[PDB]
Amino acid sequence: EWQENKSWNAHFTEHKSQGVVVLWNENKQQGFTNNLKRANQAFLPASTFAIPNSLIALDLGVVKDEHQVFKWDGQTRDIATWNRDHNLITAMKYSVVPVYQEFARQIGEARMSKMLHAFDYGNEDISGNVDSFWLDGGIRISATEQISFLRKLYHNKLHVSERSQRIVKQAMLTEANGDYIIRAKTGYSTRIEPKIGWWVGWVELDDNVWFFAMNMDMPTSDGLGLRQAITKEVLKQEKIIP
Amino acid sequence: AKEWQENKSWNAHFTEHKSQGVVVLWNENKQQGFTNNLKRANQAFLPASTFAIPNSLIALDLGVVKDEHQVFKWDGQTRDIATWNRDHNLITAMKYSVVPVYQEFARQIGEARMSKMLHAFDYGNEDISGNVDSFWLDGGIRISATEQISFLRKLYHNKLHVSERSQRIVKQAMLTEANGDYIIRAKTGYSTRIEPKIGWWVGWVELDDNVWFFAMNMDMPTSDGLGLRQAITKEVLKQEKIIP
Ligand SMILES: *C(=O)[C@@H]([C@@H]1N=C(C(=O)O)[C@H](S[C@@H]2CN[C@H](CNS(N)(=O)=O)C2)[C@@H]1C)[C@@H](C)O
Ligand SMILES: *C(=O)[C@@H]([C@@H]1N=C(C(=O)O)[C@H](S[C@@H]2CN[C@H](CNS(N)(=O)=O)C2)[C@@H]1C)[C@@H](C)O
Ligand SMILES: [Cl-]
Ligand SMILES: [Cl-]
């Protein structure tokens, strides 16, 4: 079942914001959200598209492994961490769009369309060329749809190799300590309103996994740390992390 | 290949705690090694719970362990470490150093396959003499800090003669710490059945642009000092500007 817990709206309104958190308790097969409507509204994925793009690139051999180096093209872009050589791990850490656009061009439109359909990722009616559609609004996805996709990835159930799925889950590693492991991907959609932040992923515990997907209003880049901070406040409230 | 560099200033991090030991570092990009004590870096000890790394690789490659979700049920014997008295999988068995799970792996692998695969891994002295389910606690096997690094470099590069999948699963199980600055994959040990009683910590630090392998051991006359395995290692990594 799904349970709506409107008490989590306080974690957004404390920051003069609005958003949705969606949680899924894998052991109990139960979901929770503050806003069932916004949980099911589709937003541009922005940098969260790094997950399916990386899976497809690895499965087709566009990317050999997580050590392959994608050289900087020497064009200075306005995110400083993009202006250097990357591998699949650092490209995900720094959300390096130009690396992902070269992956997409090599995948090509036909194989990209077929794979996203196989993954049941995003809307049926995608539009835009293969290096741009995932930046310019040609694909969108909801927080509940991000959870369903991430559950398939966690269980190695996507229609790509087990190896591809294991490598991308390695690249998603964000935090680990003696209490929990978080595998996740941030996003920040700026090209089309509403400007939003994403954080999608899961928390591994000794005896359970909690999937999460959040998006929130992001009128300026000043608020970007709230993607992780508000999510962690909800996880702490629900006793998932200490 | 390149000369080991000795840095005796690291001894201060041991003597601060009235302790003695060795830290060995390997800079992968530069193919350069560093230690406070070249002699002790080459001294071979029982691996104790550091053996969980090769034991898990062999169990996965032979199909004794299907994957990292397979549950190893508690046998119902109450042991003195409370976290052992519960069901485990390959991830939690490594986190809690659950010897009874690893002893079941070793019995299913058996003496012959265990001896052959440690030979294939070039692991320490390759000697499994003793009980098939305790030789890494009180039998003949011995490995040095430098030998631990040689083994871990092969694992990092998927160069051991087991499947790539087996190597990726064990590296997942070794995950110890991750933040925006670094990832540590590592395994603790504490050898208490045979003198000298020692602590171990072996593994690597992944940075954006390099990997630093480490192997440390130290005298551990009482369980008091077990946190020094990680704390002394991190003081050295901080001194060398590897972590903040
Ligand atoms: C993905 O969604 C986009 C990228 N994701 C970004 C992110 O890191 O969240 C970056 S924005 C980057 C963050 N660090 C720089 C400075 N932040 S600050 N000090 O101004 O608050 C800017 C980028 C948008 C992808 C689609 O571009
Ligand atoms: C592996 O080498 C041995 C195991 N390694 C352990 C470890 O924690 O490093 C456990 S010892 C663990 C720590 N806390 C309990 C002991 N007392 S305390 N709270 O002071 O640390 C249990 C175990 C020895 C394996 C061969 O047994
Ligand atoms: Cl990992
Ligand atoms: Cl063990």
Residue numbers in the entry:
A (entry chain A): 24 to 265
B (entry chain B): 22 to 265
Question: Can you quote the paper on this entry?
Answer:
Of the serine carbapenemases, the OXA family of carbapenem-hydrolyzing class D β-lactamases (CHDLs) represent a formidable treatment challenge. OXA-48 is referred to as the “phantom menace” or “hidden threat” as clinical isolates producing OXA-48 are often difficult to detect, missed by routine diagnostics, and the blaOXA-48 gene is localized to a plasmid that disseminates rapidly. The major active site residues in OXA-48 that contribute to β-lactam hydrolysis are the catalytic serine residue, S70 that forms a covalent/acyl bond with the substrates, and K73, which needs to be carbamylated in OXA-β-lactamases to aid in the deacylation reaction involving a water molecule. When comparing different carbapenems, OXA-48 most efficiently hydrolyzes imipenem with a kcat/Km value of 370 mM−1s−1, whereas hydrolysis of meropenem and ertapenem are appreciably less at 6 mM−1s−1 and 1 mM−1s−1, respectively and doripenem turnover is not detectable.
